[PDB]
Write a protein that binds this ligand. Structure first.
Ligand SMILES: NC(=O)c1ccccc1Nc1ccc(Cl)cc1
Ligand code: NI
Length: 341
């Protein structure tokens, strides 16, 4: 059974609703981004129209093998008509190809669905600037004031400086970066650039990256592990056992590993500043957890909502518990009161 918060009222549309079989009355299925919790249920045998970004469409065709006849890519920042309803896709500042969707209902109601997003002041000068939004379907992943983390720029600066220092001190050190989905590509691209290397990876991960429309990508990545001093591995392998095993396979080219695990928020954010972050170390292996978020912090979310001033908010994350739901509702009321709205 499809939950109410994935249905767009007054339309034949659903958002990120592929795991419920045939949804009654749904004439078009929207997909905000290529993360598995959102595409769950899509496969090569799907036979209904899917609306999405160009990048998401590349991944559907090449990774999930969805037939081309059912994939409907739309350009960003452009008014489009879908089954008689005006829609716009906006960049979500999440992972590559991730969008927010604006729906202009026949009755005059306007709905924004954020998908997954990291709110930014630049969104205040998108096509959102024009008009009023009645309903906001909101990515509430980190809707609580304890959720603080640095800018993506500060986190990248830390990674680049850490990697460049380590490898300049020891030219026989290998850098390893963990991954389990698209998103957070800047971490490994920025480290490789400072080291004057391509990023080496599996054939499957190389395929995925070739779908993302990243400029000059052929100059940045490779399947030839031997040529590269920055390697990607599955996130599950970023531990002392997994990294020891990998070092053995490199045939005496390297004698040290510096590894990075990009996480979201962790509790160590409530104690430590980014500049003060230290690794876990065992012998010749060191592992840094870095707080590289592709979701809004509490403060970024609050600013966005107080700027937009929607009439109604519908959370799409943390909706499973009464405690979570009551906590979010109390923050929404605070924000409204403080705004003078
Ligand atoms: N869920 C809601 O819609 C809501 C509930 C309780 C109190 C306020 C609310 N919505 C809101 C908050 C802040 C702003 Cl700026 C605009 C709308
Ligand atoms: Ni996501």
């Amino acid at each position: 059974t499809c939950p109410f918060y994935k249905k767009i009222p007054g339309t034949g549309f659903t958002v990120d609703a592929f795991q419920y079989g045939v949804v009654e009355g749904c004439t078009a299925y929207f997909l905000t981004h290529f993360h598995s919790d959102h595409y769950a249920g899509l496969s090569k045998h799907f036979t209904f129209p899917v609306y999405c970004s160009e990048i998401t469409g590349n991944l559907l065709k090449n990774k999930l093998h969805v037939q081309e006849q059912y994939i409907h890519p739309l350009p960003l920042d452009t008014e489009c008509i879908v089954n008689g309803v005006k829609v716009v896709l906006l960049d979500a500042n999440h992972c590559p190809g991730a969008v927010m969707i604006l729906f202009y209902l026949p009755n005059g109601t306007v709905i924004l669905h954020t998908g997954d997003f990291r709110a930014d002041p630049s969104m205040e000068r998108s096509l959102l600037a024009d008009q009023k939004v009645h309903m906001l379907y909101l990515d509430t992943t980190y809707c609580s004031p304890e959720y603080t983390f640095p800018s993506q720029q500060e986190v990248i600066r830390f990674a680049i400086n850490t990697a460049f220092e380590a490898v300049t001190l020891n030219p026989h050190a290998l850098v390893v970066c963990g991954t389990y989905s698209i998103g957070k590509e800047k971490v490994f691209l920025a480290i490789a650039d400072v080291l004057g290397s391509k990023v080496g990876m599996s054939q499957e991960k190389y395929k995925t990256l070739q779908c993302l429309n990243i400029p000059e990508i052929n100059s940045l990545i490779t399947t030839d592990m031997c040529s590269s001093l920055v390697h990607l591995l599955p996130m599950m392998q970023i531990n002392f056992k997994g990294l020891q095993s990998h070092l053995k396979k490199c045939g005496g080219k390297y004698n040290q590993i510096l590894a990075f695990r990009p996480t979201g928020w962790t509790h160590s954010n409530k104690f430590t500043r980014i500049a003060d972050v230290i690794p876990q170390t065992k012998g010749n292996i060191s592992i840094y957890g870095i707080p590289y978020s592709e979701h809004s912090s509490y403060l970024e979310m609050k600013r966005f909502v107080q700027w937009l001033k929607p009439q109604k908010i519908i959370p799409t994350v943390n909706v499973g518990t009464w405690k979570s739901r009551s906590t979010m509702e109390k923050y929404f009321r605070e924000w409204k009161l403080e705004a003078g709205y």
